[PDB]
Design an enzyme around this catalytic site. Sequence first.
Site, PDB file in Angstrom:
ATOM      1  N   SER A 117      -3.189   2.135 -10.877  1.00 61.41           N
ATOM      2  CA  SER A 117      -4.371   3.017 -10.756  1.00 61.41           C
ATOM      3  C   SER A 117      -4.281   4.135 -11.802  1.00 61.41           C
ATOM      4  CB  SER A 117      -4.580   3.564  -9.358  1.00 61.41           C
ATOM      5  OG  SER A 117      -5.944   3.933  -9.215  1.00 61.41           O
ATOM      6  N   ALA A 118      -3.157   4.857 -11.837  1.00 62.83           N
ATOM      7  CA  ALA A 118      -2.996   5.979 -12.799  1.00 62.83           C
ATOM      8  C   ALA A 118      -2.318   5.519 -14.102  1.00 62.83           C
ATOM      9  CB  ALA A 118      -2.237   7.090 -12.126  1.00 62.83           C
ATOM     10  N   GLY A 119      -1.631   4.401 -14.076  1.00 64.68           N
ATOM     11  CA  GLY A 119      -0.837   3.952 -15.246  1.00 64.68           C
ATOM     12  C   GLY A 119       0.469   4.731 -15.437  1.00 64.68           C
ATOM     13  N   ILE A 120       1.124   5.183 -14.372  1.00 63.39           N
ATOM     14  CA  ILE A 120       2.395   5.937 -14.535  1.00 63.39           C
ATOM     15  C   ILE A 120       3.447   5.472 -13.540  1.00 63.39           C
ATOM     16  CG2 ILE A 120       1.300   7.887 -15.732  1.00 63.39           C
ATOM     17  CD1 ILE A 120       1.490   9.518 -13.157  1.00 63.39           C
ATOM     18  N   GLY A 121       3.091   5.053 -12.313  1.00 65.14           N
ATOM     19  CA  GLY A 121       4.065   4.750 -11.244  1.00 65.14           C
ATOM     20  C   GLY A 121       4.592   3.354 -11.263  1.00 65.14           C
ATOM     21  N   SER A 145       3.373   0.951 -13.116  1.00 62.04           N
ATOM     22  CA  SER A 145       3.372   0.616 -14.561  1.00 62.04           C
ATOM     23  C   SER A 145       4.681   1.059 -15.219  1.00 62.04           C
ATOM     24  CB  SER A 145       2.181   1.271 -15.248  1.00 62.04           C
ATOM     25  OG  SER A 145       0.932   0.730 -14.773  1.00 62.04           O
ATOM     26  N   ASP A 157       0.859  -1.216   0.000  1.00 64.77           N
ATOM     27  CA  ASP A 157       0.000   0.000   0.000  1.00 64.77           C
ATOM     28  C   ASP A 157       0.882   1.248   0.000  1.00 64.77           C
ATOM     29  OD1 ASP A 157      -2.427  -1.445  -0.082  1.00 64.77           O
ATOM     30  OD2 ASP A 157      -3.278  -0.219   1.556  1.00 64.77           O
TER      31      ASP A 157
END
Length: 281
Positions: free
Chosen positions: A215-219, A221, A180
């Site tokens: 969730s956002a597709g940047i971190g 991912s 988390d």
Amino acid sequence: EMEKEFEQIDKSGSWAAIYQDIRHEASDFPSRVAKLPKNKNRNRYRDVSPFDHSRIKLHQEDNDYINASLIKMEEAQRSYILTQGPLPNTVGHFWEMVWEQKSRGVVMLNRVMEKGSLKCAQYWPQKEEKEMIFEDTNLKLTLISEDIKSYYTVRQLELENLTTQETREILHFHYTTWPDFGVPESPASFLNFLFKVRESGSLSPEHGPVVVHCSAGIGRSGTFCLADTCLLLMDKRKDPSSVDIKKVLLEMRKFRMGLIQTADQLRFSYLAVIEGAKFIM
Ligand SMILES: COC[C@H]1N(S(C)(=O)=O)[C@H]2CC[C@]1(O)CC2
């Protein structure tokens, strides 16, 4: 060599400093389509938008928009689609994208609920006998099998185009143990997971690009694609130590903003590449 650069940044505690220089050098391209008022409810986060130049377009005449980017790594010969966790109203668009791009794998790096909030819609079936129909995009999705391991779950899914009655098998790779807060202590189970995706054929040029999301597709991912591409370039090149993780990251940030969200994700990316290099040399 990156291992010594790692030593230096770590001993000097210059992780944030490095992270900020990446932030300042990062590309800024227009994202006009993402900001149209008719697309506001297609975006999970108002500050995470695909660039127009690299955005995936849906082949539906009404509204072609999805929060998804194509990351093309020319020297590594690897592509990835990076996307947000689907919303309740975009699950059908998600599976339409998978269909239209001829993807073989979906890589999920988050839990549906983290920190007591929903990070993603439940977009796949939980039981073999309870299939899902997306009436907006004319797709049916069935769970075929599920293999639950300590650190990740692999699922075989059947996607059916209800219009043409064609079917394809999709592999869902679900990394279930990203904490988390912060990053994993060891990159061992993340590398194991990345090798399992590779072994599946999902990242191979005979398929459309792999779909990767958190969730956002940047971190998270971002970390996945950065580690894969760096290890592939170390295999390909006459001199492995020519691989600069900061340059690769900046090349990937031409295609989608904000890849690698924290200094801790950057440090974790270096650790993953350094450790993975041992199992490749
Ligand atoms: C150990 O990671 C780097 C740490 N630094 S530092 C001083 O190395 O940049 C700051 C405090 C927490 C961090 O994890 C990220 C910011």
